[PDB]
Design a protein around this ligand. Sequence first.
Ligand SMILES: CC[C@H]1OC(=O)[C@H](C)[C@@H](O[C@H]2C[C@@](C)(OC)[C@@H](O)[C@H](C)O2)[C@H](C)[C@@H](O[C@@H]2O[C@H](C)C[C@H](N(C)C)[C@H]2O)[C@](C)(O)C[C@@H](C)C(=O)[C@H](C)[C@@H](O)[C@]1(C)O
Lengths: 122, 114, 56, 209, 9, 120
Amino acid sequence: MIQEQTMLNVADNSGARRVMCIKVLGGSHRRYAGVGDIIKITIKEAIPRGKVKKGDVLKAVVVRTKKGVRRPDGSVIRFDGNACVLLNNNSEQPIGTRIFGPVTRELRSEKFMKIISLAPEV
Amino acid sequence: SNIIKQLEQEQMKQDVPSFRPGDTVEVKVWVVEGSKKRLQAFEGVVIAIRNRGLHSAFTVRKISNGEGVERVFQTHSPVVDSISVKRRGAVRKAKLYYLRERTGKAARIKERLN
Amino acid sequence: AVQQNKPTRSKRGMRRSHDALTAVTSLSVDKTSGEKHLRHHITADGYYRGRKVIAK
Amino acid sequence: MIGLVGKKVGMTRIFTEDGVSIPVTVIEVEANRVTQVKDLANDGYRAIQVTTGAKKANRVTKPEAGHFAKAGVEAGRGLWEFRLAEGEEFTVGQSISVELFADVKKVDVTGTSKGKGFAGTVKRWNFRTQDATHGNSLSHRVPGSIGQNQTPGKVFKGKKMAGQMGNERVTVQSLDVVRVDAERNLLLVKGAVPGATGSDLIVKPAVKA
Amino acid sequence: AVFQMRNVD
Amino acid sequence: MRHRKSGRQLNRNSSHRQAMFRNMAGSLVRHEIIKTTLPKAKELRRVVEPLITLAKTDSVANRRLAFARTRDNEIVAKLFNELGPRFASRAGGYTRILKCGFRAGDNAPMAYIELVDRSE
RNA sequence: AGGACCGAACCGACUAAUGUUGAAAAAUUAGCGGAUGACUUGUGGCUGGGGGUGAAAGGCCAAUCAAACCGGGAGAUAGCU
RNA sequence: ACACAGGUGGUCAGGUAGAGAAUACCAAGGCGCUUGAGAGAACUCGGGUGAAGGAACUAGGCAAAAUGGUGCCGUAACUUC
RNA sequence: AAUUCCUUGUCGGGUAAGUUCCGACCUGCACGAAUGGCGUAAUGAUGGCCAGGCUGUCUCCACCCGAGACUCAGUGAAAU
RNA sequence: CGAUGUCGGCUCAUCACAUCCUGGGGCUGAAGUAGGUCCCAAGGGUAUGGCUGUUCGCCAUUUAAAGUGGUACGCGAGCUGGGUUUAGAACGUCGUGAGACAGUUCGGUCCCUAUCUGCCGUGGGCGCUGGAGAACUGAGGGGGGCUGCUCCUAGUACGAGAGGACCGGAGUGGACGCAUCACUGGUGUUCGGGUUGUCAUGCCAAUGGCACUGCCCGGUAGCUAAAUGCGGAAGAGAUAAGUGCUGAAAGCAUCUAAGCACGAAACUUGCCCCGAGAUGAGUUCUCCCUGACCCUUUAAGGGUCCUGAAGGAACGUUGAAGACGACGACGUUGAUAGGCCGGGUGUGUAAGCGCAGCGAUGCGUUGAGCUAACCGGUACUAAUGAACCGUGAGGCUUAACCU
Ligand SMILES: CC[C@H]1OC(=O)[C@H](C)[C@@H](O[C@H]2C[C@@](C)(OC)[C@@H](O)[C@H](C)O2)[C@H](C)[C@@H](O[C@@H]2O[C@H](C)C[C@H](N(C)C)[C@H]2O)[C@](C)(O)C[C@@H](C)C(=O)[C@H](C)[C@@H](O)[C@]1(C)O
């Protein structure tokens, strides 16, 4: 259940460490976001040799949420912490060469195929 | 009332093994992969059982590649398959939310051995 | 939060119209002693539906 | 076409072969019978009056009991009217059944909402609460301003305000139906429906396409 | 209590 | 909005409800009959009777479970040893309500409550 | 050793709520400052109105102070309501 | 001005825990505070908890929350050491 | 600048974005040396800003425990 | 001026159209995509933040778009007191001075129990012409009316390439409304367990009281969103701008003057709710009442005796109904409430005993004990027989019928 001013763990080797959801993309007066919805984010922290640096702002896709992703059977897959992969701001597609952690099944949506191609679990 | 319970019991499966909370329990899960309906395993210690007749379900945590991954499962849902108990065990207090903070060696559970 | 003018006694009386009491008129003779008493209530002598109880 | 009277029993679910869990609300529907057929002649419009259930033989009033006696049949717990589909022509006393719901596809489920009792503006119209602090005093869930000044100088009619909530007729539209078990008189409409458990209901075919 | 204050409009 | 709730707050905190009923339940036992306000008596009916149901079968544990309530050895002594067998086959209905007019002190609805037998 | 430290009694009254025809003509509740000293307090005196006193706010001088209160000049004056 | 949640100096100093006259439970002893009985709506006051986020509220981290003990390890810029 | 009207001076730092803050430039409307200038460890229920932790402050309120509100009985005001 | 509280913010809005977005068109220096400009159209919708007390403004990033204004520059008997705007103080400047400055900075009590109008709800009374029980007809009124993205058509029309549709169809979200607890969660001081200090039950053991429910860990019902179902429409009617057909005045021409056809989220309906106090008080079905004499100003007259029906009310048990009334259900030919029996659920191995150990503790008995508000059964108890209210055939006039 991502919202404005929400810190998130980085989900890939983009070199970023901590991020924050400054804005929630996708519709007027929108509040909550998650599952796989795009959210533009600032980079509050990054490792020195990473592709990205501190203060960078770019769109990124949520991959994990504490609320978890719901399923038609009623089952839900909760996670200990939020995470997101840093898509390129210009035309999607992840920047990192390796996405850590088990991406959820809901990512299956053409454009996110590159992300789920990595990380053997789920 | 009885019209409800009769409707519920008919849909209930009769092949559910008993299991104590805190036991390690694999949970097979059928899932579409965009085509083939391959089954997938999901082993993990139980932390929260919730019996509600047909509505009964149980949480299953699994600490993988860093942060843990809890997953609830309906007992009677078609999606779930075998519910084997890979490891006998026992803990006081059926709820185990406190384990969510505990990690590594703190996550140990003694075998019931009886 | 206060009147700008003084109400007529008529307006006060119309307000008093709903204040009137109504007699219950539900008294009933005892099956045994025959003394009147309120329905679903025991007699002062303690009799109730003809059986003896309380006795005080 | 005509609707039928039903009765809520309790929300449940029906598992499907694909593993999807679709919620449903059990609604028993004893077969209706036409106590009287309204028409353009004697009544000025064509319609049917119907009833269901078994009211106690002692508690039924004679003025009603004769109205059921005209139908020649034992009194129901209540009475409800349904408009004719014009092309329909039903005989008096006919035992209409739940089987008609086999082809309805989608239905609206009329019912009475739960009595929330008297309630504030927040519970009733979802008004946001004011500041809980910052010097605030005796003002939180209160409606606050309800008008301008000397212009109008009166609250507008129909203004959103605190008052009685629930306990009124309502009808969710285009609810899906799943099973139609005539043997048990079941009516497993998809999703939640208005009304307390055990309350009377009025299921009708959806006007929506 | 009556108070005091002023009316500097 | 209540809805399917049971019991009554009776303008008192639960800590007081755990004590006043605890004493009044013993008071009803000691004299086999007491005068009290009707709503409080209806509350009392759900209190005293279960103790009798506990008194239906003597055991070392039930004496202590009874001891946790009422907190009076003199009352539980009347339990099991006397009040237990006396109801015998009967199931429920251990006590009855009988309203006795309104109190003079503030028009409070008075109502006597008493055991089915009364043999003292 | 200390106009030293934390912290009750004691003293003080920074914040906020409640109260605003209040329980109270300035309080209560939850926190706060000082607490061996330029400390606090009991008891009894001293400074009396253009004066007193003041680590100074023109504050305080019996719930009133850019001049207390009581009585008197006095039915002061008022081109004002 | 009240049978008023205010103000009023000194003296007597039990048990257990505790550094303590803090505080909790108790002894001696004194009280349940001069309107009650119900119902369990908003709203208001005094509190508890809350999933996701953690100042995005707001004039302002206001208010709540949080930190909290003893023993020990260890502790920077700066300095009138 | 507790002082600068122009003014949100300009530049740099902090933030995704900073009329506030820090540093500097001096074009000081209208700084200035006992009506004291500048600097300063410690001290502060002092002013402004940032951050960690913390949280219903908020997104958005939800439920529960008590005191009123409500009804009955007793007594019985107020401004206007 | 014998007082009209004064900027902004919070909350809550309402109206206007000189229309921000969506809709319908004209023209274009309109290829398409996307624009310019103008007309019609107010149904709905019409940003979060950073700075500043600010509206405004700038910046960051969204969005189909982040409209312009009225409403005492809306709204303090609704809130906030940051600004301004008292009494303290300081800086700059002015004056010999006290002081002053739409110059600046720090700090600074926001009262009122609703009489009427108005509004949100809920009742009593009476009328609707004999009384009563239900089903109603719908005059009228309110509510709802937003829209992206993607796919098919189609990489087709168009175009040099690049790009990329008009019409129509399908799917899925954002915002909003309603309903619901079945799931996922929260609350759950009435359920169970852990544990700290102390007191008490004579003590061992076992329990209880108090300390915010002592601190907590959970957790039934109920309630509730963050949870899941549905809703905006399609169609039709008459139109606005607009596109026309025929056709004279005016041999031609012309959408119009006669006539005729299309045309929008606006209008009238359809959709949902209220609703015959709709005094213009309507219909339909059913039920109940078929006794004897005087008085008076002699009639819609005043009473007595005999009668008291349908039904209602009162009382009691009550309710997922409720502030009080009301409303639904039950009241002995009986499941309304409590209890009870069984079950479920929560808590997770009671008490006691035995065994192992020097001991704290463990094991066995044992998924045991305890279970509130749940479910299925049960008349054990509490809902007494009655009495009360309400009557005794229901005006005049006219017409149509009683074949
Ligand atoms: C405790 C109770 C007191 O109330 C208050 O404290 C509130 C908070 C004041 O506002 C305070 C605070 C403040 C800012 O007003 C909120 C200020 O403006 C006034 C001067 O004093 C009031 C109401 C003032 O009225 C205001 O008078 C203004 C001149 C006009 C205004 N009216 C036109 C709207 C009116 O409301 C004023 C002067 O005190 C009223 C006079 C009659 C009093 O002195 C009376 C005896 C007060 O002691 C009091 C009412 O009992």
